Design a protein around this ligand. Structure first.
Ligand SMILES: N#Cc1ccccc1-c1cc(NCCCN2CCCCC2)c2ccccc2n1
Ligand code: VO4
Length: 154
């Protein structure tokens, strides 16, 4: 039975298009992409329709990964469609949990991506007003945590 994950952050231009791209490369590498539906979403308005930040693009490229995602907001139907909704920080979590209450047949489990890190760096911090090394951190956190998540639910 096919499974589904939706990665989320504030804007869907930095962290979650990275997490989505990382997870997609993992499942493909493991020859299991047929068993997964994967996407990324924003809590916020700020970047609807835009491509990921240049910094995320170049970081991904450094690791041999490309994305074609356009920024989109999370919807009520997302809470019914996805098996897991994995978010980056405590604001995101709060926001998501509040929204899921107005959705009557909510099925998704809503959790911090960081909760799966074997290294226990629970928070994936918003790198918008930082530099290339902060993008790199976020990419490494993503790799650790997606690998652990897939071990546990594959
Ligand atoms: N607020 C805050 C905040 C506080 C602390 C640390 C980072 C942030 C912060 C601020 C952002 N600007 C919003 C874009 C401007 N838009 C112009 C078009 C209209 C809609 C908005 C972020 C944008 C994208 C992704 C992450 C971001 N994160
Ligand atoms: O575009 V996000 O790292 O809030």
């Amino acid at each position: 039975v096919t499974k589904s994950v939706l990665f989320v952050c504030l804007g869907n231009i930095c962290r979650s298009p990275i997490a989505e791209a990382v997870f997609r490369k993992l499942v493909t590498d493991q020859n299991i992409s047929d068993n997964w539906v994967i996407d990324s979403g924003a809590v916020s308005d700020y970047e609807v329709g835009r491509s990921p930040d240049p910094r995320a693009v170049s970081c991904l490229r450094n690791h041999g990964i490309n994305t074609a995602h356009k920024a989109r907001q999370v919807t009520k139907e997302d809470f019914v469609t996805f098996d897991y909704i994995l978010c980056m920080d405590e604001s995101n979590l709060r926001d998501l949990n509040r929204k899921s209450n107005q959705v009557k047949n909510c099925r998704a489990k809503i959790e911090l991506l960081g909760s799966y890190d074997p290294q226990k760096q629970l928070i994936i911090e918003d790198p918008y007003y930082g530099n290339d090394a902060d993008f790199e951190t976020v990419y490494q956190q993503c790799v650790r945590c997606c690998r652990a998540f897939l071990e546990k639910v594959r």
